[PDB]
Each structure stands twice: as structure tokens, then as C-alpha cells.
């Protein structure tokens with residue numbers, strides 16, 4: 001989902017902006033890695049030759065089996081306008097963008113780069129003691145404020161504003177408090193890489209009039225940089241952008257020189273367990289985790305009763321489950337969290353359970369259920385309890401002079417998909433408030 | 446004598462396979478043949494009686510054959526205090542480790558030829574019935 005999200009955002013950008021975005025080799029090196037392997041192979045083939053190759057020649061390279069992959073590769077490459085298709089002499093010739101070609105050539109052959117990757121001050125600092133602690137603390141503060149646990153040093157107005165203006169962290173002044181949503185829980189369920197990418201993408205969409213190309217220059221150059229080394233300070237917009245990025249725990253400033261941190265390298269590519277937990281038939285949870293973030297997120301749907309240094313023990317209750325559901329969290333997401341943080345003991349016992357099931361009846365390959373089905377049934381039943389009462393807003397139509405007219409109006413409502421209930425014997429029906437105006441207009445006409 | 450006859454026939458007679466016991470046989474009875482247990486009426490929230498009733502089928506004769514799993518059914522009406530009492534009477538089994546599975550529907554129920562109280566007419570008749578539920582010589586003279 002990482003590459004998919006980044007590629008989708010880059011695809012939505014206009015071609016005019018993309019052409020200027022491909023000016024710096026630093027951005028090109030990052031964009032190149034996101035494409036599918038076949039697209040990367042074709043791009044590498046095309047970069048080093050200053051000629052035009054027909055699309056049929058590219059098709060010849062792919063075997064019959066990878067013919068499907070060829071379609072996805074070409075579609076993705078054409079969506080970003082990376083390959084410009086020119087038709088002449090009866091042949092659909094394919095060529096690479098000149099700016100992208102020159103940028104890749106400079107990056108690979110060490111040509112002129114205009115210090116897009118930056119310079120080195122040769123004044124190194126202790127990464128483990130300062131960079132790691134700083135970024136870990138700041139990311140922990142933002143995630144703590146997201147999960148809602150009390151915290152002294154609240155995040156800055158920049159990130160707070162981004163959070164509110166985004167779908168994440170719905171807030172209301174009338175209530176005077178901030179609460180997590182379904183997308184918030186999904187964000188917390190996503191990995192560190194995707195967790196950073198989500199916030200960065202929201203910032204990219206939020207920024208208005210600071211150039212869009214400049215923001216990507218800075219982000220991709222930051223991904224290019226390596227942790228544990230100095231980098232002298234750049235664009236005028238990039239100065240304030242760097243100060244803002246310091247608020248996300250990505251780059252550390254003394255108070256003239258900025259230093260990338262572990263998350264800066266985490267942005268480019270990826271890279272007993274902490275968080276693994278045991279769920280008992282008594283609706284008890286024992287998570288072998290020592291982290292306030294994990295404790296707070298567990299508190300969303302667990303009625304915590306106590307804690308130890310090595311683990312956290314809690315009990316599942318209707319109140320906690322209803323709290324989590326009211327926050328918009330889906331039972332599927334909850335079970336996904338539990339399954340991906342299942343203990344090795346639970347996984348081994350579930351593997352033995354599946355082995356016993358298949359040994360008893362190997363004809364049917366039953367699904368692997370890590371946790372007892374009763375908990376899943378109870379959670380889904382509580383969701384059904386919340387969904388028991390169903391209500392709609394609208395108006396009721398009755399007192400129809402003619403059955404033909406009644407049927408005409410009801411059928412029109414059904415056709416436009418705003419009909420919720422009808423009764424021919426009573427010649428009555430109900431329509432949604434959304435379709436009320438359309439039904440009234442049709443009745444008048 | 447009659448209850449012993451019932452038990453002996455339910456045990457050794459091929460014709461009979463199901464019986465309807467009550468609170469009398471809740472505890473301290475050995476039934477090596479009993480395998481399936483069903484509860485339609487329960488004595489309120491009694492957690493001890495829950496376990497004692499379950500104890501009857503824990504000594505089934507064919508309790509060691511591969512793939513065997515005894516069954517314990519608890520019928521409860523939803524949206525009633527029967528659910529309150531049912532959830533209160535299983536807090537000891539849950540503590541021991543037994544987990545109850547909620548069965549919303551039994552597949553293939555409609556294909557049975559005849560079902561008791563299947564007609565609304567019989568439903569109305571049963572409704573009314575259940576509602577209506579609530580001198581030695583003078584010795585010859587006499």
C-alpha cells in the first residue's frame with residue numbers, strides 16, 4: 001500500500017507540474033524505485049540510449065506468462081506521463097521524458113547535480129544518543145496525542161491544524177475534545193513507513209500556494225540523505241518547510257545545520273516481538289508489550305485493570321467494545337490487530353488446531369483462526385446489537401387517487417434508488433429525505 | 446421403580462434414544478451412556494446447578510473415540526431477562542475455561558416434514574390456553 005499510495009498521489013498531479021518535478025535527480029531517484037519491476041527494467045533500458053524504440057520491441061521482451069504484467073507496467077508508466085508516446089510513419093514510437101532522462105543520467109554517472117543531494121559539514125553527532133532519542137520522543141508525543149492519552153508537551157499548532165483539517169482526528173469545539181476515527185485506527189494499524197507517508201501526503205494536499213514541486217524536492221532529498229551525518233543549509237520555501245518538518249520528528253536542528261534522523265531513511269524504503277499478546281477464552285488479554293503507545297491503543301477496546309513492566313493485562317467488556325465501536329473502529333480491524341499481534345504460543349496452538357482439523361478431515365482446508373471463534377462471535381454480536389435499531393429520515397406518501405399514479409411514483413423512486421418501503425394494499429410508500437425533492441419534482445411533472 | 450424402568454429402557458433399548466429429565470437428575474447420578482445434554486428450562490441464575498447438570502454427560506461411554514465432541518445446548522429467548530440469568534449462570538464455566546458458542550440459526554430446519562406449533566391458528570390457541578393457565582347398631586346409618 002506504500003508504493004500504491006505514493007504512486008496514486010503522484011499520478012493525480014498535472015503533467016505540467018510533473019515535468020518541472022523531474023528536474024532534480026534527487027526526486028527522480030526516489031520516483032524510479034516506486035514503479036513496478038518491469039517498468040523499472042524498461043526505464044533502465046531506455047535511460048542509457050538516446051533513441052526511440054517502438055512499443056512492439058518492448059512487448060517482445062516480455063514472455064507470454066508476464067503478458068499481464070506488461071499491461072500494468074505500461075499503464076502505470078503512461079499514467080505519470082513518464083513515457084511520451086509519439087505516433088509517426090505509421091508506428092507508435094515510445095520515448096522517455098528528456099528531463100527525466102537527463103536527471104537519471106546525471107545521478108547515475110555523477111554528472112552535474114546542482115547540489116540537489118546537499119553537502120556535508122563533516123561535523124558528525126551521536127545518532128543513537130541524540131537523533132534516535134529525539135525522533136522517538138517526538139513521534140511518540142504525536143502518536144500519544146493521537147491516541148488521546150494525556151501528555152504534557154502537546155504537539156505544535158502546525159501538526160494539530162493538519163490533523164484537524166484532515167479526516168484524521170475528528171474534533172468539535174462544541175464538545176471541546178478530540179477523538180479518533182476509523183481512519184485514525186487504520187493509521188495506527190499501519191506500519192511506521194505508511195504512518196509517516198500518510199501524514200506527509202496529508203501535508204502535501206493541505207499546502208496551498210511553497211511550490212508543490214519544491215515540497216517533493218525536499219521530501220525525496222530527505223529520503224536520499226543518510227542518518228548520522230551533517231548537511232549544511234536551500235530554497236526559501238524549503239527553509240520554512242524544514243522548520244515545519246522539524247515538528248514531525250524527521251529532521252533535528254540545534255536551535256544553522258540540520259541532521260536527518262532514522263525516520264528520514266525509513267521514508268525511502270522498508271527497514272519475542274514486542275506487541276504480541278495472548279487472548280483467553282475468559283475474554284482476558286495479556287500483551288507482552290512495554291510501550292505507552294501500545295498500551296494506549298489497547299485501552300481503546302480493552303478495559304485495563306493493571307500493568308507490569310513486561311506485559312499489560314486487561315479484560316474485554318461490553319463497555320470498552322462499545323467505546324471502540326462508537327469511535328468508528330471495525331471488528332475486522334480489531335481482529336486484524338489481534339491476529340497480527342498474536343503470541344507465538346497462540347500461533348503454535350492455532351497451528352496445532354488447524355493440523356488436527358485437517359488430519360480429522362483433510363478434504364476441506366479450514367481457515368486458520370489464531371484466536372477462539374467465541375471472541376469473534378461475541379464482538380460481531382455486539383456490533384449487531386449496536387446496529388439493531390435502524391432509522392431513516394424522510395417523508396411518507398399516501399392518499400393516492402389512482403393506483404397507476406401510486407405505482408408510477410413508487411417505481412420512479414425505486415429506479416432512482418430512494419425507495420425504502422412500499423405497500424400496494426395500502427397504496428403507500430416511504431422515500432429517503434435525499435430523494436424527497438426529486439420525487440416531489442417528478443410528481444409535479 | 447418407574448424412573449428406574451425409564452432409565453433402563455433409555456439405556457439398553459434401541460427404539461428409545463432421548464429422554465426428558467428434570468431437576469431430580471441434576472447431580473450425583475452416573476450415566477455412562479448419556480452423551481448429549483439440552484436445557485430448555487433452567488433454575489434461574491444457579492451457577493452450581495449449571496455445572497452439576499453438565500456433569501451428567503462428562504462420563505459418556507464413547508468419550509474416547511477419535512473426533513468425539515459432546516454437545517450442551519442452552520436455549521434462551523433474546524431481549525428478555527432470560528439472557529441476564531443465562532449470562533449470570535455460566536460465569537463459573539467460563540472461569541474454568543469452557544466457552545459457549547452462540548448459534549443464531551440451525552441450518553436445514555425448514556426441510557423437516559412436521560414442526561410443532563407451525564400455524565398461526567395454533568399459535569393463537571396456545572396463546573389463549575397459556576394465558577388462561579392462571580352407637581354400634583346405628584352404624585348402619587353411616
Ligand code: BEF
Pocket residue numbers: 472473474475500
Ligand atoms: F456425583 Be458426581 F459429581 F456426578
Ligand SMILES: [Mg+2]
Pocket residue numbers: 473474
Ligand atoms: Mg458422586
